[PDB]
Amino acid sequence: NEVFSRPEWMILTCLPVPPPPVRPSISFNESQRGEDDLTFKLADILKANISLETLE
Amino acid sequence: KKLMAQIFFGPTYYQRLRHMVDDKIHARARGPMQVLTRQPVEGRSRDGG
DNA sequence: AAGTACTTGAG
RNA sequence: UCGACCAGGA
DNA sequence: CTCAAGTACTTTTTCCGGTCATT
Numbered sequence: 001n002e003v004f005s006r007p008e009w010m011i012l013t014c015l016p017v018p019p020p021p022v023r024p025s026i027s028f029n030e031s032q033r034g035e036d037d038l039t040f041k042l043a044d045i046l047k048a049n050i051s052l053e054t055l056e
Numbered sequence: 057k058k059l060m061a062q063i064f065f066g067p068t069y070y071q072r073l074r075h076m077v078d079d080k081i082h083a084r085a086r087g088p089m090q091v092l093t094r095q096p097v098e099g100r101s102r103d104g105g
Numbered sequence: 106a107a108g109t110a111c112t113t114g115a116g
Numbered sequence: 117u118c119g120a121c122c123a124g125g126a
Numbered sequence: 127c128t129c130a131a132g133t134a135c136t137t138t139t140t141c142c143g144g145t146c147a148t149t
C-alpha cells in the first residue's frame with residue numbers, strides 16, 4: 001500500500017525507541033538501579049551502531 | 057423420636073488435612089497493581105485479584 | 106504427532 | 117516487588 | 127523438467143505456599 005506499507009519500509013533505517021512505560025526500570029531501593037531487558041538490548045544496538053559508524 | 061431407620065454407627069480413623077478455609081478465603085475490591093500491565097497483582101499473598 | 110510449506114533430487 | 121523452579125488444591 | 131522424499135515449524139484444559147538468585 002502506497003500510503004501505509006511500501007516494500008522499502010520492511011527494511012529498517014531509523015529505529016523507534018519505546019519509552020520507559022514499555023521497558024520499566026526495576027528499582028530495588030535507591031542505589032539499586034536495575035534496568036529492563038529491552039533497555040539492555042537497545043543499549044547493545046546503540047553500542048553496535050556507534051562501532052559501525054566509527055569504522056565508516 | 058426414634059429415627060425410622062437404624063444408622064451404621066462406630067469409630068473410624070479420620071484425618072485432619074492441611075486445607076483450612078481461613079488460609080484460602082479472599083476478597084479484593086481494588087488494590088495493588090502490577091507495574092507494567094497496570095492490572096491487579098497475583099495471589100492472596102500479594103492481595104491480588 | 107501431524108499438518109504445512111517449502112527446498113532438494115531423481116528420471 | 118522481580119520471576120524462575122519445585123511442591124500442592126478442585 | 128515431473129514428482130518422490132527430506133527439510134523445517136507449531137501447537138499441546140481451566141482457575142487456585144516455599145525456596146532460590148537476583149533484579
Ligand SMILES: Nc1ncnc2c1ncn2[C@@H]1O[C@H](COP(=O)(O)CP(=O)(O)OP(=O)(O)O)[C@@H](O)[C@H]1O
Pocket residue numbers: 126139140
Ligand atoms: N486437571 C483438572 N483440570 C480441570 N478441572 C479439574 C481438574 N481436576 C479436577 N477438575 C474439576 O473437578 C471435577 C471432578 O473432580 P473431583 O471433584 O476431584 C472428583 P469427585 O467428584 O469428588 O468424586 P468422583 O471421583 O466420585 O467423581 C471435574 O469435573 C473438574 O471440573
